[PDB]
């Protein structure tokens, strides 16, 4: 209910729907002009938000201290407006919790949520042969158009849809000390 309400105004306030040379995926900008994606849409130096060319000043894919994969690009847009920050929705570690709400915002499903149910810290995954870590898991079949769905619970950010096996669902965890 309230999880619901609080998707809903994260979603109208700071995401958007991009594309890129690998597909269109669900944004959300998270202060400033950085916003995520999924590693896997592969941004190159232009973009498209919301049907708009925007350059990409930056970009930095996500790794953990050993170098592995955490399946997250970070995206500095050079654009006027700035994100509403979010960082004080996003926690030091990964979130477990019983009842979550997975977000999407394409051409596809526009304005789409999804009650996933129970988020559980998976932690390492072959994620389409690559080794990952910080995945949160949910048992839902999502499908292809919903990675950058963002997963959310009352007051949290909990990460960005990036993967599925066709049974579950995985997120990587949107941790505050990225975005430092
Ligand atoms: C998203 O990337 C997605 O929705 N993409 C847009 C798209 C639209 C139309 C056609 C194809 C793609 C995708 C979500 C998955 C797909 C099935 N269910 C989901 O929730 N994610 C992937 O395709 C990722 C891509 C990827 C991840 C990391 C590095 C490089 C690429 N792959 C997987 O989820 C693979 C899973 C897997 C599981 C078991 C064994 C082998 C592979």
């Not at 930056?58 to 399946?71: F, H, P, Q, R, Y």
């Not at 997963?151 to 995985?170: A, D, E, P, Y």
Request: with cysteine.
């Amino acid at each position: 209910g309230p999880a619901f309400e609080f998707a809903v105004a994260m979603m109208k306030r700071n995401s958007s729907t991009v594309k890129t040379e690998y597909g269109e995926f669900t944004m959300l900008g998270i202060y400033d002009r950085w916003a995520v994606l999924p590693r896997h849409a592969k941004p190159g130096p232009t973009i498209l938000m919301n049907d708009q060319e925007v350059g990409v000043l930056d970009a930095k894919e996500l790794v953990d201290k050993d170098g592995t994969n955490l399946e997250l690009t970070l995206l500095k847009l050079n654009r006027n407006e700035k994100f509403r920050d979010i960082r004080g929705f996003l926690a030091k570690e990964e979130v477990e919790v019983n009842e979550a709400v997975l977000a999407i915002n394409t051409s596809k499903f526009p304005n789409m949520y999804i009650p996933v149910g129970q988020v559980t810290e998976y932690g390492f995954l072959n994620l389409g042969g690559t080794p990952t870590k910080r995945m949160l898991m949910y048992n839902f079949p999502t499908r292809a158009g919903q990675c950058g769905g963002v997963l959310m619970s009352t007051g949290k950010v909990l990460g960005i849809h990036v993967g599925g096996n066709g049974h579950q669902g995985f997120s990587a965890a949107l941790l505050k000390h990225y975005f430092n």
